C-alpha cells in the first residue's frame, strides 16, 4: 500500500509518515515536491540528497521522530543500516544510511533484518520497538539501544544527549541516555570506556560544569591559576593565539565559544557532516588571523583537563589515542624543554 | 485511488493505464520516470510537456487508445476539454487539452461534465462510451462522435481516417469514420459541408484516386493535358518552381511527395503541431531553391482540382474561402488574362 | 591517476578509455559532458542513466569494446557484476551492472574479484583476458566465457552472435561464439541444453536458413504447403490475424519482419531493455488492428518449427516450458481436435 | 528594442528572425522555448548549446539562411567571429562562433567590426551584404566571400558546395561557389592551391566523375586494372580489409559508400563536429571487423589518385603533407620493395 | 595533475586548493559537487554562477585566501583580470573576473600575463607574490598592490580594510592597507586623492570616530547642535524622514545603522553585487514609510561632514562630483535660502 500521494497526505495531515489512509495531489518540479492547498502549490520538500526526489521524500517522511543516537555515534560504531526505520542526517539533509530494511521499495535490500544479505551488515536496532531486542539476539552483526536493562546483557552507558527532529538535547520529559550493546560475527562485544563529545553550538553555548562556567567568566590568568594547569599550553590550545597571520591553536569548542561572544569570526564548514572532530576554515573578524584547517572537538573542559593532565610530557613529537564517542582519535603531542608546546587532533 | 506507483504498475504490465491493482517502485530524475526491473532502472517516460513530470506521466498512461479524431479536427470544432478521457497529441508529445474531467487529481476541473464549470466549455463526448450520448444531450457546449445513428440527431459524416495510438489510418478491422454532432449554448448546430485533408506523409504517400495515381506516374505535361488543366498554373502551384532562389508554389502535399521520390529536400517544421494547413521552411537539396514559409495542405487531388476549377478567373487578386476539416481556409487567387497565375493559403 | 579530464582525453584521442596520459578541458552542463575543441564546445556524452553524469561518462568510456555476451544472456545466467571491465547495456544506454570491481572509484565495491564482498556475487570472467580463467577457478560464484577449450570442464556452446559496440553480429573476422562455464557456491554447474534467440531487428532482418528465406519470399499458403505445417496454426501464431480490432497471434519476429516489408506498423517498447521475450504495444497502420501487450520472441524459424512439432496435442490447454538463452520460458499451448489453436509466451 | 517575445513572434510568423515588429507569449522550461498557440504550448527550440537557452534561441533565430561556407572551411581559414550575422553549426547544433558583432546584446563584443576589440580577430564578411566588402577593406584581420570579382583583388576559387539551412549542396538556382579573400595584419594574403573535400554522406552518396562511377560499378580487380593502380594498395586503403579483427585501411568516403550498399556497418561519431578529416569508431556488421579511430576523408577519387601517384615510393616510412580545404593535412606513407603498403591521415 | 578529483582532494584535506597530490571520488548532480566520505555523499559546493558546475568549483577552490582588495575597488580601478590567482566575489558567490591567467584550463586566456592577449587588459598584480612587481613593470595595463614601498614608484595609500575569505576587516595580525599603483598604455598613472567607503554592515555596525560614537548615542537635535550642522539638512540626509508614505533621504549607512537599533526595517538588495553606492528597496516596519530606490553610501561621518561643509550653498540645483574608492561619484545638491535642502547620489 506504498504511494507518493499517501506519503504526502501523511506529511500534510500528521507532520510526517504515520501510516494513515488517504491521498493528496502532488507535483514534482526539479528536486521539489509540491501539493495543492486551496488552488495554490505548497512546497513540502526540497531534495538536497543524491537520491531521486520522490525516494528522498519518502525516506524523509519516514524518519525516526523519537530521540535517536546522533549519526556520529552510529558512524563510529560502524552502523551500516537500520532495522525498519530511517535515521535522518540533519547535518547533510540526507538519510544516514544508503539502504533500508522494510522501509521503502526503492532503497530496501530486504523486508526483514533476518534475510541473508543483512548478515554481514551491522544493523541498528531500537529496543523501544516491539521485537527488536529479539531481532538483535538473532542478528550476526548489530548495534542495540535500550532505555532499560536487557536480560543477561551487560550495558554500556551512552551519551546523555540524543537527536530529536534535528534538535540535540538532554531529555527531561523524554529519555535520551541509552544503554548500548554490540555484536560482531554472532558474538556480543564489550564496548570500551569512552569520553563523549558534548554536541554544543557556538551561537548558543551552554557550560555543563563549574570549570566550564569558570572558563567563560574568569580571565586567562585567573582560570589557569585557579584550576592549576600552567605548563599545559592552554593559552595556545584552548584560548588561541591571534597575534600572527596564521591563527594559533583553538581546538576546543568552548574556546571558540568564549572568543565568539567577545569578538565574532567566520567558520567555514567545508565538509558539512556529523563527526567527533570537525574541520573548519576560520577567519577572525577582529585581527585578520586565519587557519584553513582548524580541527575542533567539543569535549567537556573537565574531560580535556583529565586527558592533557594524564600524558607523558617527554617525547618531542608523539601520538595519543583517546576513546571518544566509542572511536579512537589520534593527537599530535608536540613537546619542547619539558613542557606542552601544543596538543591537537591528527590530520596526516 | 490515484497513485504514481499504480500508474507505473499498469504501464509495465498492461502497456498503458488499465485500472488494475498493484504497485511498482518508481524513480523520478530530471523529467524522466524510471522503474526498477531486476535491480536496474528502466526508463518508462520522458516528459516533453510543460506539466510536472509525474502529472504528464499519468495523463500519457491514461491516453485514449481507441481510434479518435485527429487533433486538428477537434481544434477546428473548438473542443476545449474531453469527457473522462485524455486525447494525447502525438505531434506535440503532450495532452491535447490543458485540463481534464474525471481523469487526474492534478488536472481535473471536474469529476463529471455535468458540473457548472464545464457548461461554457466545449466538451468532447465519445458515443462509444456508455452514457456519453446522454451527457452530450444534457451539455450546454459540446462535440459528439458516434459510430452509428443517434435518435433525433442529424449527423455530419466525418473524415474517413482517425488516429489510433498516434497512427493516422482508415480502419478496416476498426471503425475510423464517425458521425459528428455539435452543440453551442444548448442548441444543436448544423455542421458545414466540408472537404477533409488526407493526413498523409511524404515517405509513405499513398494515392487515393486514379487522378492521384496519374499524377505520380505521368510526367507534368501529359498529366496537365490528360486532365485539361492548361490555364490553372499547376506547374507552379502543385509541381513547384525550383528555378529561382525562392522556391515557387508547391502548396499540395502530393506535389512534395512527387518531388521527394526524385530528389530529396529538407522541411523545417518550425510550429510543430497538428493543423489543417502546415507551414514549413523548405530547402531543396538539388537546386538550393528555398522558402521560409511554405504553406502545405494535403487535399485529395480531385478535390483541389474541383476547388480551382470552380473559381471565376476575371480579377487580378481575390480571397477565396474554402471549408476544410470544418474550418474556413482563406486562399489567395491571382489571375491574369483569364488564367490562374497562383493560388495559395493566405498568410496575411 | 583517475580523472575526468584524462577519461575525456582518451575518448577524444582514442575513441574510448585506453590508459594513455593526458588531459582535455571539460564542461559539465545538465547531464552532458563537453570538451573545448579550437575554442568551441563539443558534446562527448549525454547521460541517459540514473547515475551522476561524470560517473556514467567514466563507465561508458571504460566499456568493453571487444565482442561481449548480450545483456539478456548475462541476466539469464544470474551475472551480478563483471571482473575488471564494464558491460555497457546499449538497450538502456546505461551500464549493465550497478557496481564494479577495479573500474571506477565511485562504483567499485572491490579492486579485485578475490575480495570478501564478491564471494556471494556471480562475477562475469572473460577468458580472453590474462588470468581471468584462473580467477574463475578461485571464485565462489561466477560465469566464464572462452574462445577455446578449458582444461577439464565440459563447455556449453553459446549463441553464434555477440555484441561489439552495440552491434549484435556473427563474427567472421572475430570470434563471437563463446564457450560458457558457470560456478555456484564453488561447484561448476552443467549448463542446460538451450535454444538461443537470434537478436535481429525488423528494419535489417536477415534470414539465417533456407526455411526463413522461403518464409520471406513465398506467400503464407505456398510456405505452409511446402513445409507441411497445416495444423500448427502458423496463420495465427506466426503470420498474425489483422481481421479484428485486437491483433491475433504474431509472436515470432520473422512474422513481424514479413508484415513490415508489405505494410508498416508501430511498436511501442514500453519496457526498453534486453530480454529473451519482448512485449510491445502494436498498432497496424493498414488495418487498425492492435494489442497492448504483444509478446515477441526471435527464434530461428526452424527451431520454432522443431519446438511446436515436439508437442502433444491431446489437451485443450497446457503450460509448455522451453529452455531459451539458458532460461526456462513458459508458453501456453491451446489445442482442439488434435491441431494447434494458439501457442504464445505465458504472462498471466 | 530586442526581445525574447519579438524573436519568437518572428519565428512563428517568418520561420526565423526577419526584423518584424510584434510579440507572442513565451514559456521557458528547462532548456526549451515554448509559445502558446490556441491555448496549448508549442515547442519552438531546444537548447543543445552551452549558452543560456534564451541566448541560444536568439542566435539560432538570427542564423544566416543564405548559402554559407561550411564550418570546416571557416575554421581552416582561422575565422574567429562573423560581421553582423550568425553562422549556425548544424553539426554541433550551436553557433559556429562564441561571440558576435551587431547581432545579440548578450554575446556582442562590438556593434560594428571597426571597433578596437575586433582588430586582432579574423572577422568573416559576406560580400553579398551591402557595405561588407568596404568593411573588409578597413579590417585588419578578415576573411571575405563574394559571388563575383572585386576591384583590384586576386580571388581564390572556393569549393563548389556551400551550406544552406544545414543542407550542403552544389547550387543550381543559387550560387554556392564563392571567391575567397584573406587579410592578415592589414595585408591581403595569397591563398594556397588546395584540394577540397567533397562533403558527401554514406546513405546518399553521389559520384562526381567517371572514375568514381567506375569505382562504384566495377569490381575491385578490374577497377585497379582499368586505372593502372597495381602497387598503390587501393585494396587496403580504399576498399578496406575486413579479414582480421582490426579493420584494414578504409580511409576514403567513396570506399565506405561502396561497402555500405553491399553490406551496412555502424559509424560512431565520437567527436561530433565539422572537420576536413573525420574520426569514427567503425564496426562492420557482416564480419565483426572494427577500428576505434578510423580517419576518413571525402576526396574526389581522381584527386586521391593524383595525390598517391605523385609520391616517391623509396622510403619505408614518411610524412606526406597535402593542402586540403586551405589547411595542411599530414599523411603517413608506408612503402616496401617500391610499392605502397599503406597510406593514411596521421594522428599521433 | 589538473583534475576534478585532485581539486576535490585538496578541498577535503586542505580547505582549498593547495597543489597537493591525491584524488577523492566525486559526483556531479545538478549544480552540486559531492564527495564520498565513508560510503555517504557529502556536498562540497553548490554552483551559484553562470559557469559550468565543475569550472566554478575549480575556480572557487583556487580562490585567493590572503587579504585582497574588495571587488568594488578593483572594478573602480578598471581591473579586467587577475595574474595567476582568482579573486572570489562573495557578494555574487562567483569569480570576480570572467577569464583567468595560469589558473584553470577552461577559463585561461593565457598562462602568463606577458602574452599578447593580456596587453590591452588591466591585469591585477599582487606584490606579495614573487615576481609580480616585475610583471607589473613589464605590463602595458595593470594595477599593483604592495605592503611596502617599491623603488621608483610613488604610492597611493588604499583603504584601511581588505577582504579575507569574504570577511572585510582592518588587520592587526595581517596587513590589509595596501599601496596602489596603476598604469595605462605603459605609463604609470597618478591615482587621484580619494575618500574610501568603510564597508560596514547594519547588524554589527562599528563607529570609527568620536563623531560616530556620538551620532549613535546622542539625540538628533543634540548631535546637530554639538557639531553645529544646523543648515546642512542632516535631519533629512543622514537621519531620514519617516513621516510620509515615501521615505525621505537616508543615504548614509550610519543613519540606517542608527535607525535599525531602535526599529528594524527591510532592505531589498535587488542588484546583489559589490558597489561604492548601493540601491535598496527599503520598507520601514514601524511607520510603513518606503522607497523603491534608496541610494546608500558608507562614508565615515567625519568625511561626509567635510564634503557637505566644502559646498557653496548659493544655487538651487547643482551636480557635486566626489572621488570615492578611486571613482567619481555624482551627487545632486539642492539648496534654498542659503541652506541645504537635500544632497543625494544622482541616478538620472
Numbering used by the authors:
A (entry chain F), B (entry chain A), C (entry chain D), D (entry chain E), E (entry chain C): -1 to 346
Could you pull the original sentences from the published paper?
The NSP15 endoribonuclease enzyme, known as NendoU, is highly conserved and plays a critical role in the ability of the virus to evade the immune system. NendoU is a three-domain 34 kDa protein that was demonstrated to form a barrel-shaped hexamer in solution by the assembly of two trimers. The oligomerization is mostly driven by the contacts of the N-terminal (ND) and the middle (MD) domains, while the C-terminal domain (CD) carries the canonical catalytic residues from the endonuclease family. In terms of substrate specificity, NendoU of the coronaviruses is described to cleave a great variety of single- and double-stranded RNAs in an Mn2+-dependent reaction, by hydrolyzing the 3′ end of pyrimidines, with a strong preference for uracil, and to release 2′,3′-cyclic phosphate and 5′-hydroxyl ends as products.
However, the most drastic similar effect was obtained when we added the DNA oligo(dT)30 to the samples in Bis-Tris at pH 6.0 and in PBS at pH 6.0, where we saw the immediate formation of 2D crystals of NendoU in the frozen grid, which somehow had induced the same pattern of arrangement of particle in all directions. Due to that, we tried to use this condition to obtain a crystal structure of NendoU. Furthermore, the same crystal pattern was also observed for NendoUmon and NendoUhex when incubated with other DNA sequences such as primers (data not shown), suggesting that this packing is somehow induced by the presence of DNA. If we compare the arrangement of adjacent hexamer units in the crystal structure with the low-resolution processing of cryo-EM filaments, it can be inferred that they follow the same pattern, with hexamers positioned side by side in a C1 arrangement. Furthermore, polar surface structural analysis showed that this pattern allows the perfect battery-like piling of the negatively charged S cavity of one hexamer into the positively charged switch region of the adjacent hexamer, indicating that the biological function of these two regions is related to the formation of large order supramolecular agglomerates. More in situ studies are required to confirm the existence of these molecular entities inside infected cells. It is important to state that despite our efforts, we have not been able to identify any electron density suggesting a complex with nucleic acids.
